[PDB]
Design a protein around this ligand. Structure first.
Ligand code: A1A1J
Ligand code: MG
Ligand code: MG
Ligand code: MG
Ligand code: MG
Ligand code: MG
Ligand code: MG
Ligand code: MG
Ligand code: MG
Ligand code: MG
Ligand code: MG
Ligand code: MG
Ligand code: MG
Ligand code: MG
Ligand code: MG
Ligand code: MG
Ligand code: MG
Ligand code: MG
Ligand code: MG
Ligand code: MG
Ligand code: MG
Ligand code: MG
Ligand code: MG
Ligand code: MG
Ligand code: MG
Ligand code: MG
Ligand code: MG
Ligand code: MG
Ligand code: MG
Ligand code: MG
Ligand code: MG
Ligand code: MG
Ligand code: MG
Ligand code: MG
Ligand code: MG
Ligand code: MG
Ligand code: MG
Ligand code: MG
Ligand code: MG
Ligand code: MG
Ligand code: MG
Ligand code: MG
Ligand code: MG
Ligand code: MG
Ligand code: MG
Ligand code: MG
Ligand code: MG
Ligand code: MG
Ligand code: MG
Ligand code: MG
Ligand code: MG
Ligand code: MG
Ligand code: MG
Ligand code: MG
Ligand code: MG
Ligand code: MG
Ligand code: MG
Ligand code: MG
Ligand code: MG
Ligand code: MG
Ligand code: MG
Ligand code: MG
Ligand code: MG
Ligand code: MG
Ligand code: MG
Ligand code: MG
Ligand code: MG
Ligand code: MG
Ligand code: MG
Ligand code: MG
Ligand code: MG
Ligand code: MG
Ligand code: MG
Ligand code: MG
Ligand code: MG
Ligand code: MG
Ligand code: MG
Ligand code: MG
Ligand code: MG
Ligand code: MG
Ligand code: MG
Ligand code: MG
Ligand code: MG
Ligand code: MG
Ligand code: MG
Ligand code: MG
Ligand code: MG
Ligand code: MG
Ligand code: MG
Ligand code: MG
Ligand code: MG
Ligand code: MG
Ligand code: MG
Ligand code: MG
Ligand code: MG
Ligand code: MG
Ligand code: MG
Ligand code: MG
Ligand code: MG
Ligand code: MG
Ligand code: MG
Ligand code: MG
Ligand code: MG
Ligand code: MG
Ligand code: MG
Ligand code: MG
Ligand code: MG
Ligand code: MG
Ligand code: MG
Ligand code: MG
Ligand code: MG
Ligand code: MG
Ligand code: MG
Ligand code: MG
Ligand code: MG
Ligand code: MG
Ligand code: MG
Ligand code: MG
Ligand code: MG
Ligand code: MG
Ligand code: MG
Ligand code: MG
Ligand code: MG
Ligand code: MG
Ligand code: MG
Ligand code: MG
Ligand code: MG
Ligand code: MG
Ligand code: MG
Ligand code: MG
Ligand code: MG
Ligand code: MG
Ligand code: MG
Ligand code: MG
Ligand code: MG
Ligand code: MG
Ligand code: MG
Ligand code: MG
Ligand code: MG
Ligand code: MG
Ligand code: MG
Ligand code: MG
Ligand code: MG
Ligand code: MG
Ligand code: MG
Ligand code: MG
Ligand code: MG
Ligand code: MG
Ligand code: MG
Ligand code: MG
Ligand code: MG
Ligand code: MG
Ligand code: MG
Ligand code: MG
Ligand code: MG
Ligand code: MG
Ligand code: MG
Ligand code: MG
Ligand code: MG
Ligand code: MG
Ligand code: MG
Ligand code: MG
Ligand code: MG
Ligand code: MG
Ligand code: MG
Ligand code: MG
Ligand code: MG
Ligand code: MG
Ligand code: MG
Ligand code: MG
Ligand code: MG
Ligand code: MG
Ligand code: MG
Ligand code: MG
Ligand code: MG
Ligand code: MG
Ligand code: MG
Ligand code: MG
Ligand code: MG
Ligand code: MG
Ligand code: MG
Ligand code: MG
Ligand code: MG
Ligand code: MG
Ligand code: MG
Ligand code: MG
Ligand code: MG
Ligand code: MG
Ligand code: MG
Ligand code: MG
Ligand code: MG
Ligand code: MG
Ligand code: MG
Ligand code: MG
Ligand code: MG
Ligand code: MG
Ligand code: MG
Ligand code: MG
Ligand code: MG
Ligand code: MG
Ligand code: MG
Ligand code: MG
Ligand code: MG
Ligand code: MG
Ligand code: MG
Ligand code: MG
Ligand code: MG
Ligand code: MG
Ligand code: MG
Ligand code: MG
Ligand code: MG
Ligand code: MG
Ligand code: MG
Ligand code: MG
Ligand code: MG
Ligand code: MG
Ligand code: MG
Ligand code: MG
Ligand code: MG
Ligand code: MG
Ligand code: MG
Ligand code: MG
Ligand code: MG
Ligand code: MG
Ligand code: MG
Ligand code: MG
Ligand code: MG
Ligand code: MG
Ligand code: MG
Ligand code: MG
Ligand code: MG
Ligand code: MG
Ligand code: MG
Ligand code: MG
Ligand code: MG
Ligand code: MG
Ligand code: MG
Ligand code: MG
Ligand code: MG
Ligand code: MG
Ligand code: MG
Ligand code: MG
Ligand code: MG
Ligand code: MG
Ligand code: MG
Ligand code: MG
Ligand code: MG
Ligand code: MG
Ligand code: MG
Ligand code: MG
Ligand code: MG
Ligand code: MG
Ligand code: MG
Ligand code: MG
Ligand code: MG
Lengths: 48, 275
RNA sequence: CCGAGGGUAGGGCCCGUGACUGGGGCGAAGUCGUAACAAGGUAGCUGUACCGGAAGGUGCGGCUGGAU
RNA sequence: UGGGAGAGGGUGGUGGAAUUCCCGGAGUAGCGGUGAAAUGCGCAGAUACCGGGAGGAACGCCGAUGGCGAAGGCAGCCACCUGGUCCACCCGUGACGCUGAGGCGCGAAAGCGUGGGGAGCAAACCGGAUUAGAUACCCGGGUAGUCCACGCCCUAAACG
RNA sequence: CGAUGUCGGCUCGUCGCAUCCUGGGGCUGAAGAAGGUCCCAAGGGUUGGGCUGUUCGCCCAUUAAAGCGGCACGCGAGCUG
RNA sequence: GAAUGCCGGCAUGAGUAACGAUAAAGAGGGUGAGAAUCCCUCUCGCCGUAAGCCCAAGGGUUCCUACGCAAUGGUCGUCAGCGUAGGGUUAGGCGGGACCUAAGGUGAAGCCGAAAGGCGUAGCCGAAGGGCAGCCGGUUAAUAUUCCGGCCCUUCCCGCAGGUGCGAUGGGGGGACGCUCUAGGCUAGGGGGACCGGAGCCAUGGACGAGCCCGGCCAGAAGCGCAGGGUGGGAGGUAGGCAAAUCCGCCUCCCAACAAGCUCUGCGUGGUGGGGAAGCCCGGGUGACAACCCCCCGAAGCCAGGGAGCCAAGAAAAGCCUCUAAGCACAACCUGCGGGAACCCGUACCGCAAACCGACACAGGUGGGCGGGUGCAAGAGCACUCAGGCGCGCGGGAGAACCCUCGCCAAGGAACUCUGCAAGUUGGCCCCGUAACUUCGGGAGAAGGGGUGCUCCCUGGGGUGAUGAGCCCCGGGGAGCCGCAGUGAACAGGCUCUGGCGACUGUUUACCAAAAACACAGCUCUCUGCGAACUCGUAAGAGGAGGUAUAGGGAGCGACGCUUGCCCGGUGCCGGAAGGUCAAGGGGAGGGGUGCAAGCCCCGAACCGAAGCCCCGGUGAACGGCGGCCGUAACUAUAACGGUCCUAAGGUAGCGAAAUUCCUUGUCGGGUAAGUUCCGACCUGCACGAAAAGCGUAACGACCGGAGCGCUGUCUCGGCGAGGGACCCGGUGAAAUUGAACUGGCCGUGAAGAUGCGGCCUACCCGUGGCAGGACGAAAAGACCCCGUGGAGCUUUACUGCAGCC
RNA sequence: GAGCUAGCCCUGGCCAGGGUGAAGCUGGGGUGAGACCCAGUGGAGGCCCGAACCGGUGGGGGAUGCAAACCCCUCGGAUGA
C-alpha cells in the first residue's frame, strides 16, 4: 500500500532546511545543539 | 415563483429552484467584480472558528454601493437586473448619467429602464435614497444605514423591509425585519421599497448535495458525539439530553439571552423583537 | 400447415370458507345516567370540527319545523 | 336609441366609533364576576379619569315588512373595471324558440396545504362554581380557527 | 492467574453396566398371543427428518430397539465457531 | 549459576521448511579451468488500454566500453543495476531563471504582546495557472527540438530610411475563465484498392492467378485556397474612471449590419529538404531512378476566446493595445530594412519499476500523454494477434497420503448447515409479453417466453460521390443447408412471495463491526439589531461576513402522509424598579492603648449599600413525569357504573409476546409430514406511546428475518481426473523453542492429572513417510477475577480551585 | 512532526461505451379564453447497466506470508455530497 515516506525535495527543504531553522527560536537551538554535538551536517541534504 | 420538478429522481421530488424571471443580464460587470476569498470558516490562525463551512461553488464578489449619498442629485438608469451569488437579494445595475456604474440591491417592483435618484429631495419612489427624516411616516424602506455615513446595515436580505413608525427629535422610529422597534438617526439613509425576490424563503433545497454546493458541510449533532466532544456526547444506546440542552462549549441553548447587558445601544432600542 | 387436448408461466370475474375483528337486527320484567317530546327545565334541528362512559356537550355558520 | 334603481361582482384607496396592549400623567383600596360565590386581577399602585402610540377586526344612526343576485350570498365612504335587470320610443333581424341526460362553472360555515396576520371572539384544553356525578349548562383563563393571498374541499333545515 | 481455551456441533473412537434391542431364565393377578416384575448377560446393534446456537426437549415417519453414563461436562498444536 | 539480566561467541531444531506468482520450455552451435543458468540460431509459450512507447516526480552514475568473479545475486555464473578503469549529458527557440500574479508566506507604514515573539494595507516572494520565439531528417559505443543538414523564427544594441505629439509603475481596454449538451469544417489515426513500386515464391491434391507476400509517405517561409475566431464607422455634448486625457463610460445624431472590410488562427497547397518494406547477402549492404496514387471510416484533438441550455453563477497579475502627466519635442516612440549581441541552471540512465515508496532484485503503492488490427450490438470490456517486450535468478525426476486451485459424476435434489455458507443455475443482443401496489416517476431487465449460424435469390432507406459507380452504414421478404449444440470459444443477472429497520444517493471504526450507526433534504425551539451572537487568541487581530433577521450561531428531530395528549409542585431558562439576605465601601452610637497635654494609634453599633440567592409569576419540539385498594349487571364471567386514599398530573390517539414480553416454545390461526424461528391475530404492555417523536408509507439496501420455485458434490456418499506442492536426487539453506536426558503401558502414590516414585507388565539397536492423544506442548510476566492507601479517560446537585460571564 | 492520515484553501487533470427519456419548444386537438391532451423535437438527473478510477460485501487462500493487512473468486459507487 501507500507507505509514509513520499520524498519531495521542495517539501524537505522548506520544512527542515537551514533557512527554516534560522527563522524561529527553536530552530536555532536545533542548529546550536547539532553544532555543539559536532554533527557533520546540521540540516538534511536535498539536491535542489 | 419557485419552480417545481417532476419526481424523476428521489431528490427531484422536492427540489424547488428560483424562477430567475426578473434577471435580464447573466454575466456581471467586469469593472465591478473582484475575487471573493473563500475561508472554510478558518481565521487568520487557520483554526476553524465557524464549524461546517467550505466546499461551495466558486464566486466573484460584486461591489455593491451601500452609501448612495455618494452621488446626491445624479440620477441613474436601471440598466439590468442580475443574479448575485453573495446574497439572497438580486442586484440592479445602474448607469448614472455621469457615466459611473454601480450596483445596488434590487428592491421589489423595480423595472429596468426606470430612473432612480438619491438625496434630501428625491421623489418618494421605489429605488430612491433619502435621509430617513425626509421619508414620510409609514413608508416601507430597505437598506437602512444604522449610523450616519457608515453604510446601509439593516433590511438587506431577500424580501425584507423596515417600516417608518414615527419621529422623535433627530431620530426616527423603525420597525426592523425582526419586529424590534428602534431609534435610527434621521440623517441615516434608506431606500424606498422592500427588497425583492420575496419568494426566496420558499426554496426547498431537496437534496444533501445542494447544501454542499452552497458551502454548507454536514452538521453533526452533539447527541451523536462522545463526552470528550460535547455535553450531549456519550450514553449507551440513544440518550436524551440529561442536562439543560447545551452548545459544544457548555452554554445553554434553549432560552439563555446573550445580548450584553450594559451595551450603549440599549438606549436606542425601544422594544425587543417578537414571535 | 391447421388441429382435440396435454404441459409451462402470468393475469381477470365469481363462489365457498378463515383465527380474529366491525357495526346491524331481534329478544316479558338487567346495569348507568335522562339527550329528545312542555320554554322538557340550556328552544330544537342542522353541515362541519373538536372533545367525552353513554346518551351527548361545545365552537362556527344555517333553518323554524321555536316558545313566550 | 334614450334613460333608471340597486349591500350585484372584482381591484385599490381610505374614515370615525369601540375593545386590547404599551408609554406619560393624576389617584387609592379595591376591581371583576354571580342566582349567590369562587377562581382571577390589585399597594410590585389595579379599577375609575385625562393625553399620546401601536395593531387587528367589524361598519352604529340611516335601516325598512326595504333593495340586488341564478343560487350560495351581498351593508362605512371614495375612484376604477364589470354582470344582471327594468322602463320609454316601436327604429332593426324575421321563429333565430322552450327545456335540457351527460359536460363545464359557481357554491354559507366548518375543514385541509403554503405564506402572512392576530385586537376582539373562541372548539380543544386548564381552572372556579353547581351537583349524587357535571367529561355540561354559569364564571376566570385559553390554543386552533375566526382575518388576508393563492390552492384544495363541494356539504347543509344549500328552504318557499 | 511468567495462561490447565470456555458452550453446542462435526469427526474419530474407547470404556462402564444401574440393559434400550437381540440371547438365557424365575414369579405373574402367565389360557393363547401380547404384557408386567425381578435374575443372568456388554457379543453385536441402538434410523432419517421439522423447530431452536442449543445440550436437552417436543413433534413427524419408521424400527428389534430408537439405552443411560465415564473418558479435562472425551476430542479447537483435528475442523467449526 | 540463575535477575524472560547485559554484550559476544557458538550450539539445537536440520541437511529439515524454503529458494517469492503454475506465462513454459526443448535442441544445436560457440566461449571458458568450470556452463540447465553467458552469447548466437532454430523450435515452443506469455503480454499486447501492456508485461509495449513517451513525460513528470523520486533515485543519483545505476548509462556506454574494456578488464574481472571474493562478496552481493535466494542455485549456477564465463553474466549482471556487482568490483577496477576509461569514456559519456553540448540549447537565444525544450524546461526553470534574468516575466506575471494564486492560496499561502513575508512585510515600509502601523498595531499588540513580561522576554522569546504575535498581527498587518501596500510592496515583495510563491506555479503544474498566465505569458513567451523550432519543425523535419541524419550522426554516436553512449547526447541531441541541444551537434550537423535543410528550411523558419524571438529579443536586445546600433545605424539608415519613412511615419507620428513622443512620453508611465498612473487612467482605460484586453488578458478573463463554470457545468452539461453540441454545429460545420478539418487534422491525428485507421480499413480497402482489380491502381502504382518490389526481392522472390508455385510446395503436398489443385492454382502462373485481376495469385501470394511487402510497401505506397514526412517536414516546409511567402503567396494562394477552404474553414473558423475576434471587431461596427463618424459626429456633438460630458459634471464619472481620486491629476490629465483626444482614450474609457454615459446621452444624442447620421451611416454601416445574418454580411463586408480589417485582423488573427487552424487545415490544405506550397520553392525545397528528407524518408523509403518484404526478401536476399555479410547494426550494415541490396532492393531502389523505389513507388509514393485513388476510395472509404474518422476523433474526446484542431479552428476557439465557437454555439445552445442551465443554476450551484464560474482567479489574479504581467505581456499587449489605447489615453495622456511631468518632461521632451537636436529628443522620443511607431514601421521597414541592415549589421552586430543573446547569460545562468537541467539534459546521462532507471521511471507501474531489480534503479522510485515499502529493511530484500519484496505477487503491495506511484500522477499525465500514446496505446495498432479482427470478431463479438458498442467499448479503453473479452479472445487472438502487430510493433515492441517477456518465460517471472534453482533445477532434474517420481506420479503415495494429505493440502491448494480446477474439471466431471449414476439415482436423489438442501435430506447439508447457525445459514443453500460455498458452488450450481441465470447470463449479451433482438422481438412478444409483463402483477399487487404507487408519491404516477416508478415497481421493470418484474415475471415468462420466442429468436440468434451458414448459403442462394428478391428488395427499402441513409452517408460520401454527381443525381451514377465504387466504398460505407441501418434494414425488409422468400427458399435452403449442416450439427448434440449457431451471443457454437471468451467477457455478460438466478427468480418470486412476505416481514423488521433506515425514506432515498451518500459516510464510518486506515488494519476483526459498513450496520438498524453518522450525514441528509425537511420540521421545531432558542439566541443574535451588527463594533451582532458565537468561535480562536493574554492581546492586537481574525473568522462570522465585505453577510444583516427570507440572515448568522446553538440544540433536538430526520423525505413524505396522518398526527404529536395531560402535569409548571422540583431543576433549567425568561419576566418582575416591592419585600427579605447580601461584600468592599460609606456612616461612627460607644469603647480602648499610650502621652503632662496638645495629639498620635486601634476596636467599633444603628443605618445607607450591587450582582447573586430567597420570594411572586411564565415556560415542554426546556430537564423531566404521566397512580393504588375495594365494590357493582336477572346463569356464570367480566365490569359501562360507584366508594375511598394519594398526586404537580395520573399514559390520550396510535401501536403491542414487539430489534421492547420476564413467566414463554403465552394462546389461537396460517404455512410444514412435523415449525422454540416466520406471518396473522388476541392483550394480565414483568418493562410501547407521541420531535431521545408515535403509527403508516411507493421507491431504495453487498443491512437482519421467514417461505417457495429453479439448480446444484451442500448432502445421502463418495468416486475419478488435472495442475502447483508434499515425496526422491544435485545446488543453496532458515525459524521459534531448548535445565540436562540414557525421555514405554497399567494400577497406585505423590502439592490432589507422573517418561523420572512403588509394584507389576511390556520392550533388540537406528531411521524415513504420515496422524495429532500426551509431554498440564509453543507463543504472550491472564486482557477475566481480586489485591496496590498504583495509573489514566469520562461524569456529576463529591471537594476545592481556575478561565469565562455577572 | 499534516512528505502517513483528517479537514479546508489555491491551481490543474480525469470519468470507454451503452440505456432511460424531465422541463422547454414546435405542431395538432381543445376552450369564450383557458387548463389540459396527442405527436414530434429535445437531452434533464446525488437516474439505470458497465470499464478506467475509487471502494472493500460474502467466501476461500495466506498466517516464521509475496505482504507488519497481501492474493483469487464474488460484490458497491462510477456527472458526483
Ligand atoms: C467460564 C469460562 C469463562 C472459564 C474460563 C474460560 C477461558 O479460558 C480458561 C479460563 C481458565 N484458564 C483458561 C485461559 O486462560 N485460556 C486462555 C487461552 O488463550 C488462548 C486460546 C484463545 C483465547 C481463549 C482463552 C484464554 C482466556 C491460548 O492459546 C490458550 O493457551 C489459553 O491461554 C476459564
Ligand atoms: Mg494511505
Ligand atoms: Mg519537488
Ligand atoms: Mg515539488
Ligand atoms: Mg512541497
Ligand atoms: Mg513552514
Ligand atoms: Mg528552509
Ligand atoms: Mg529567541
Ligand atoms: Mg536567539
Ligand atoms: Mg566534516
Ligand atoms: Mg536540522
Ligand atoms: Mg420538485
Ligand atoms: Mg407528478
Ligand atoms: Mg429573479
Ligand atoms: Mg479586474
Ligand atoms: Mg475573509
Ligand atoms: Mg494572513
Ligand atoms: Mg502562523
Ligand atoms: Mg462555530
Ligand atoms: Mg468549517
Ligand atoms: Mg446572505
Ligand atoms: Mg441573487
Ligand atoms: Mg442612529
Ligand atoms: Mg427555509
Ligand atoms: Mg455556493
Ligand atoms: Mg442545515
Ligand atoms: Mg445532524
Ligand atoms: Mg453518541
Ligand atoms: Mg458513538
Ligand atoms: Mg480531542
Ligand atoms: Mg471534560
Ligand atoms: Mg463534558
Ligand atoms: Mg448525555
Ligand atoms: Mg449515545
Ligand atoms: Mg436505553
Ligand atoms: Mg451511542
Ligand atoms: Mg428527550
Ligand atoms: Mg435524563
Ligand atoms: Mg447543560
Ligand atoms: Mg430584538
Ligand atoms: Mg393428449
Ligand atoms: Mg338486578
Ligand atoms: Mg339539549
Ligand atoms: Mg330532558
Ligand atoms: Mg336538564
Ligand atoms: Mg332543552
Ligand atoms: Mg367541552
Ligand atoms: Mg395588595
Ligand atoms: Mg410601596
Ligand atoms: Mg399587534
Ligand atoms: Mg318595427
Ligand atoms: Mg365552498
Ligand atoms: Mg371559511
Ligand atoms: Mg374544576
Ligand atoms: Mg355535592
Ligand atoms: Mg388566540
Ligand atoms: Mg330561509
Ligand atoms: Mg489461571
Ligand atoms: Mg512462560
Ligand atoms: Mg489457564
Ligand atoms: Mg503461555
Ligand atoms: Mg455434518
Ligand atoms: Mg390372557
Ligand atoms: Mg452388549
Ligand atoms: Mg454398548
Ligand atoms: Mg435440538
Ligand atoms: Mg430446551
Ligand atoms: Mg413443550
Ligand atoms: Mg418387540
Ligand atoms: Mg456420555
Ligand atoms: Mg461436570
Ligand atoms: Mg457442568
Ligand atoms: Mg469438553
Ligand atoms: Mg473439546
Ligand atoms: Mg482453533
Ligand atoms: Mg469446541
Ligand atoms: Mg493445543
Ligand atoms: Mg492436538
Ligand atoms: Mg494441546
Ligand atoms: Mg544464586
Ligand atoms: Mg530469552
Ligand atoms: Mg533483568
Ligand atoms: Mg543480553
Ligand atoms: Mg567480538
Ligand atoms: Mg549472541
Ligand atoms: Mg554463530
Ligand atoms: Mg551440540
Ligand atoms: Mg544442520
Ligand atoms: Mg533429506
Ligand atoms: Mg522435522
Ligand atoms: Mg520456511
Ligand atoms: Mg517463501
Ligand atoms: Mg495470477
Ligand atoms: Mg493457477
Ligand atoms: Mg534448454
Ligand atoms: Mg551456467
Ligand atoms: Mg559454470
Ligand atoms: Mg531459465
Ligand atoms: Mg542468449
Ligand atoms: Mg489490442
Ligand atoms: Mg536510492
Ligand atoms: Mg561472484
Ligand atoms: Mg567464484
Ligand atoms: Mg561465484
Ligand atoms: Mg550471493
Ligand atoms: Mg533474493
Ligand atoms: Mg572465463
Ligand atoms: Mg553515457
Ligand atoms: Mg538553438
Ligand atoms: Mg542581465
Ligand atoms: Mg516563497
Ligand atoms: Mg510558469
Ligand atoms: Mg518552426
Ligand atoms: Mg471577461
Ligand atoms: Mg473575471
Ligand atoms: Mg484560469
Ligand atoms: Mg451548474
Ligand atoms: Mg498534418
Ligand atoms: Mg478503421
Ligand atoms: Mg505539408
Ligand atoms: Mg471632462
Ligand atoms: Mg533503406
Ligand atoms: Mg541506389
Ligand atoms: Mg479527453
Ligand atoms: Mg479551445
Ligand atoms: Mg462561448
Ligand atoms: Mg490579486
Ligand atoms: Mg511642461
Ligand atoms: Mg530639439
Ligand atoms: Mg503611431
Ligand atoms: Mg546576468
Ligand atoms: Mg539529453
Ligand atoms: Mg500497479
Ligand atoms: Mg504510467
Ligand atoms: Mg529495470
Ligand atoms: Mg526475481
Ligand atoms: Mg515489485
Ligand atoms: Mg497497423
Ligand atoms: Mg459487445
Ligand atoms: Mg518460468
Ligand atoms: Mg507477471
Ligand atoms: Mg515420488
Ligand atoms: Mg467443463
Ligand atoms: Mg450427481
Ligand atoms: Mg428441488
Ligand atoms: Mg428438482
Ligand atoms: Mg432450508
Ligand atoms: Mg455468460
Ligand atoms: Mg402478484
Ligand atoms: Mg402492473
Ligand atoms: Mg408483489
Ligand atoms: Mg407495498
Ligand atoms: Mg403507475
Ligand atoms: Mg427476460
Ligand atoms: Mg428466425
Ligand atoms: Mg457454419
Ligand atoms: Mg447483470
Ligand atoms: Mg440507509
Ligand atoms: Mg443507517
Ligand atoms: Mg422509520
Ligand atoms: Mg418514511
Ligand atoms: Mg452514488
Ligand atoms: Mg479497529
Ligand atoms: Mg475495521
Ligand atoms: Mg490498526
Ligand atoms: Mg473483514
Ligand atoms: Mg457495527
Ligand atoms: Mg454497505
Ligand atoms: Mg458512523
Ligand atoms: Mg435519512
Ligand atoms: Mg420530517
Ligand atoms: Mg420555523
Ligand atoms: Mg477562547
Ligand atoms: Mg479570550
Ligand atoms: Mg504575557
Ligand atoms: Mg471580511
Ligand atoms: Mg444555522
Ligand atoms: Mg441522523
Ligand atoms: Mg429521512
Ligand atoms: Mg413542571
Ligand atoms: Mg411555575
Ligand atoms: Mg418550573
Ligand atoms: Mg430571572
Ligand atoms: Mg441585590
Ligand atoms: Mg428522570
Ligand atoms: Mg419530575
Ligand atoms: Mg388525542
Ligand atoms: Mg402482546
Ligand atoms: Mg411492535
Ligand atoms: Mg418492554
Ligand atoms: Mg417471550
Ligand atoms: Mg425467553
Ligand atoms: Mg409452540
Ligand atoms: Mg398450523
Ligand atoms: Mg404477529
Ligand atoms: Mg394475555
Ligand atoms: Mg429510546
Ligand atoms: Mg412502524
Ligand atoms: Mg416500508
Ligand atoms: Mg398513502
Ligand atoms: Mg442502503
Ligand atoms: Mg446495506
Ligand atoms: Mg428457501
Ligand atoms: Mg466434495
Ligand atoms: Mg496432481
Ligand atoms: Mg532414492
Ligand atoms: Mg546440497
Ligand atoms: Mg548461497
Ligand atoms: Mg541430565
Ligand atoms: Mg543423559
Ligand atoms: Mg527415546
Ligand atoms: Mg518408549
Ligand atoms: Mg486427592
Ligand atoms: Mg497418576
Ligand atoms: Mg516409565
Ligand atoms: Mg526422578
Ligand atoms: Mg531414577
Ligand atoms: Mg523412592
Ligand atoms: Mg520408578
Ligand atoms: Mg516402577
Ligand atoms: Mg503392559
Ligand atoms: Mg527425508
Ligand atoms: Mg516425518
Ligand atoms: Mg500430539
Ligand atoms: Mg497436548
Ligand atoms: Mg505448566
Ligand atoms: Mg496441552
Ligand atoms: Mg500472541
Ligand atoms: Mg513486567
Ligand atoms: Mg500476571
Ligand atoms: Mg499480559
Ligand atoms: Mg482489551
Ligand atoms: Mg479472583
Ligand atoms: Mg484509601
Ligand atoms: Mg493499603
Ligand atoms: Mg489509585
Ligand atoms: Mg487525572
Ligand atoms: Mg490561573
Ligand atoms: Mg457566552
Ligand atoms: Mg505526497
Ligand atoms: Mg479541475
Ligand atoms: Mg463516470
Ligand atoms: Mg433498453
Ligand atoms: Mg424521444
Ligand atoms: Mg430548447
Ligand atoms: Mg448515478
Ligand atoms: Mg440498465
Ligand atoms: Mg478483501
Ligand atoms: Mg482500499
Ligand atoms: Mg462466494
Ligand atoms: Mg495477518
Ligand atoms: Mg487481492
Ligand atoms: Mg475478480
Ligand atoms: Mg454502475
Ligand atoms: Mg458513466
Amino acid at each position: 500500500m501507500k507507505r509514509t515516506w513520499q520524498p519531495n525535495r521542495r517539501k524537505r527543504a522548506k520544512t527542515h532546511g537551514f533557512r527554516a531553522r534560522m527563522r524561529t527560536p527553536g530552530g536555532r537551538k536545533v542548529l546550536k545543539r547539532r553544532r555543539q554535538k559536532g554533527r557533520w551536517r546540521l540540516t538534511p541534504a536535498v539536491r535542489k | 415563483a419557485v419552480k417545481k420538478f417532476k419526481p424523476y429522481t428521489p431528490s427531484r421530488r422536492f427540489m424547488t429552484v428560483a424562477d430567475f424571471s426578473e434577471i435580464t443580464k447573466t454575466e456581471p460587470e467586469k469593472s465591478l467584480v473582484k475575487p471573493l476569498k473563500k475561508t472554510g470558516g478558518r481565521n487568520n490562525q487557520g483554526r476553524i472558528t465557524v464549524r461546517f463551512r467550505g466546499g461551495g461553488h466558486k464566486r466573484l464578489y460584486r461591489i455593491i454601493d451601500f452609501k448612495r449619498w455618494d452621488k446626491v442629485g445624479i440620477p441613474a438608469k436601471v440598466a439590468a437586473i442580475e443574479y448575485d451569488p453573495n446574497r439572497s437579494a438580486r442586484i440592479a445595475l445602474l448607469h448614472y448619467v455621469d457615466g459611473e456604474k454601480r450596483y445596488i440591491i434590487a428592491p421589489d417592483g423595480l423595472q429596468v429602464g426606470q430612473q432612480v435618484v438619491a438625496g434630501p429631495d428625491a421623489p418618494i419612489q421605489v429605488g430612491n435614497a433619502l435621509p430617513l427624516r425626509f421619508i414620510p411616516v409609514g413608508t416601507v424602506v430597505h437598506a437602512v444605514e444604522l449610523e450616519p455615513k457608515k453604510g446601509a446595515k439593516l433590511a438587506r436580505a431577500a424580501g425584507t423591509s423596515a417600516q417608518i413608525q414615527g419621529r422623535e427629535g433627530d431620530y426616527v422610529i423603525l420597525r426592523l425585519p425582526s419586529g424590534e422597534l428602534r431609534k435610527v438617526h434621521g440623517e441615516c439613509y434608506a431606500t424606498v421599497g422592500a427588497v425583492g425576490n420575496a419568494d426566496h424563503k420558499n426554496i426547498v433545497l431537496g437534496k444533501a448535495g445542494r447544501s454542499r454546493w452552497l458551502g454548507r458541510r454536514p452538521h453533526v449533532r452533539g447527541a451523536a458525539m462522545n463526552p470528550v466532544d460535547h455535553p450531549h456526547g456519550g450514553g449507551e444506546g440513544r440518550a436524551p439530553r440529561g442536562r439543560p440542552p447545551a452548545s459544544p462549549w457548555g452554554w445553554q441553548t434553549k432560552g439563555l439571552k446573550t445580548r450584553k447587558r450594559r451595551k450603549p445601544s440599549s438606549r436606542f432600542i425601544i422594544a425587543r423583537r417578537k414571535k
